[PDB]
Amino acid sequence: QGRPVLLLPSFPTPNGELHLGHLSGPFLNADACRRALLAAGERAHLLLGTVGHQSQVSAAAEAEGLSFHELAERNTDAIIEGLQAAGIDWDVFVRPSEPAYPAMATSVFESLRDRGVLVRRTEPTNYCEPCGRFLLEAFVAGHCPHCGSNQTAGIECELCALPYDDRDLVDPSCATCGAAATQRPLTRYFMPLEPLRDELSGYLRGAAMHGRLRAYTERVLAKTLPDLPVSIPAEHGIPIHVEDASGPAEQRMYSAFELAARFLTALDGFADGWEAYARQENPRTVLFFGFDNAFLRAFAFPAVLGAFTDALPLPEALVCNDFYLLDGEKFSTGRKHAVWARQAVTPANADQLRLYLAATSPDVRRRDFTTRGYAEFVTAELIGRWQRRLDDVGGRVAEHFGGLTPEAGGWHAEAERFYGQIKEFASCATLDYLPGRFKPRAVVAAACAFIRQAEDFAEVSADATPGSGIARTCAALELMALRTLAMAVWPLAPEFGRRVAAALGEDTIALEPTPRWVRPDTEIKFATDHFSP
Ligand SMILES: Nc1ncnc2c1ncn2[C@@H]1O[C@H](COS(=O)(=O)NC(=O)[C@@H](N)CCC(=O)O)[C@@H](O)[C@H]1O
Ligand SMILES: [Zn+2]
Ligand SMILES: [Zn+2]
Structure with missing residues (x-):
């Protein structure tokens, strides 16, 4: 159309x-x-x-x-x-x-x-x-x-x-x-x-x-x-x-x-x-x-x-x-x-x-804004967990891959599962921004749950054998996940999305159901201060 x-x-x-x-x-x-x-x-x-x-x-x-x-x-x-x-x-x-x-x-x-x-x-x-x-x-x-x-x-x-x-x-x-x-x-x-x-x-x-x-x-x-x-x-x-x-x-x-x-x-x-x-x-x-x-x-x-x-x-x-x-x-x-x-x-x-x-979108109910609820979201969730993943992924890319995005090697079960989670997040975002079923509240909730899925996978990435192809896959997936977060939250946090995008080497991210790899050899440096408490 x-x-x-x-x-x-x-x-x-x-x-x-x-x-x-x-x-x-x-x-x-x-x-x-x-x-x-x-x-x-x-x-x-x-x-x-x-x-x-x-x-x-x-x-x-x-x-x-x-x-x-x-x-x-x-x-x-x-x-x-x-x-x-x-x-x-x-x-x-x-x-x-x-x-x-x-x-x-x-x-x-x-x-x-x-x-x-x-x-x-x-x-x-x-x-x-x-x-x-x-x-x-x-x-x-x-x-x-x-x-x-x-x-x-x-x-x-x-x-x-x-x-x-x-x-x-x-x-x-x-x-x-x-x-x-x-x-x-x-x-x-x-x-x-x-x-x-x-x-x-x-x-x-x-x-x-x-x-x-x-x-x-x-x-x-x-x-x-x-x-x-x-x-x-x-x-x-x-x-x-x-x-x-x-x-x-x-x-x-x-x-x-x-x-x-x-x-x-x-x-x-x-x-x-x-x-x-x-x-x-x-x-x-x-x-x-x-x-x-x-x-x-x-x-x-x-x-x-x-x-x-x-x-x-x-x-x-x-x-x-x-x-x-x-x-x-x-x-x-x-x-x-x-x-x-x-x-x-x-x-x-x-x-x-x-x-x-x-x-907290008051989509089908009256819902409450307090300065407390808002401040806790910023410090505990956005800083304490979203900012934290950027830093954790970014510093480990520096530590083990010289700050360059590696190219995915082979796969295993834990990578399958995490990739499938990336697919469910990307899918929620493409669907719940649609005029015909607009629910931004579910996109944010899917983001928060996805951050936690990415926290689990960090443990998987940390334990991969250094130098191996699966170790590259885990890191490429961790980057892919952050790329998908920037894609998914851009309509709500366009400056945050644009900044994460540019750290991944892209001026725009298509909103789409298919997750994408970060370009191999892309230098990865995230800012530490996207949100302000
Ligand atoms: N506490 C609240 N939480 C969430 N939404 C709220 C709100 N208070 C108002 N709204 C919504 O905001 C929109 C504009 O509100 S408003 O300034 O009172 N104007 C009117 O309601 C009508 N004069 C609009 C006429 C027109 O569209 O041409 C309206 O859609 C109104 O429904
Ligand atoms: Zn009435
Ligand atoms: Zn009168």
Whole structure:
């Protein structure tokens, strides 16, 4: 397949900086996926941005005193710096004020309205008379009807992500003044999703996702599908005129409806013409997101995108994660419970921190970050054992082979077994970086177990008869194993992988199931200080 791969992590909301939970979720997942795809010889492009309108930015802008626009651009700068600190690369980044964006968003609404996909509905909607505003998205507080959580923003429940109508939010209240909501009639544009039930079912049946997300899609599809809000009264946003409206006629595009337009604006800038590129290159698209975005990315995004265009296939894989915890409580921008990326990530610890977030990847469970757990990983595992193998193999190559990589001679049983272990590690790495079954956590665990297998084999190498062919084989295998480690961890620790690679005399290592020998006579000198405690 010569198809290019589009990696589309969630566009972070520019109401703050990124914390380590963000990194541990869609951003490290998408960057490591991209890197493994490049290492396997594919074309891979990560599309990013903070473009769009989220009501959280408007609300944060009120409190902070700034305008929506100032606050989004300021936080976009900070988000960009944290991503670069963590080694997250991108092929395009769409800022909140991208001039070509509103045309794109408007094109999607008008094209859906004109083709009959949308409706205008009038219903009683929560309103705050003292504040003088309708109570929706981030401006309403209340409880999810499915799970009872109060971690909501109108139709979005952070805990279960199960959809529901605005009028179903339990115990609504003004999120600004606390007053219990009353009501007012309002007329808004909606996109019904229940007509699309068969298309969405079929689309998701053929998409790749893990079982936790699959079972979520089944719970969603076990009830009727709410209408997706399209328009909304708000101070900021892409304008939408609502005809024959009870309530304000001049409204805005609801953020959830913007998802398709955010994607295509990014692709348009990356390709200089998104629609020609889509039809001529037939890209594969891979989504990365946290579980609070599960409805938005498994349902609302394909629904809107697929009704707008067929120039590109809908995303073939959905790489969903749960929330990273900090000392047992979720990383939270709002609640200011966080370790911030700009403050904590340095060139010296980027590789080891990415390795640790992957070793603890909150893939199907919320998992915990503590500074203790992280520090012990660095010193005991990465230094105490990964660094140790490099040194042990390196110094014994110096001691017994004049620092040159020997050429494998004959074999015996212990070499068979170790080579077979090298094959199982290499195989885990090629498979578990795949978009279709992305599990970096298993690659790190396979690395740790492999280091221990290599520690056993060092005993075998130490006891081979000096000067013999089997002694050469053992050393060639020990080098082959370190070459395979650098191959296997490169997507997560690219600087560490590149440095071990160059000590083995290679500028790049293909990501592949077949282990390779180190070139005989290659001078072997490893650095002693890859990681920093
Ligand atoms: N503690 C945590 N651990 C692990 N992942 C976490 C996380 N907190 C957030 N996330 C995930 O990080 C992604 C971005 O988070 S976010 O800034 O709040 N923005 C949003 O959720 C939506 N505004 C994205 C809209 C879009 O994609 O266009 C989102 O995919 C979110 O799910
Ligand atoms: Zn109020
Ligand atoms: Zn819920």
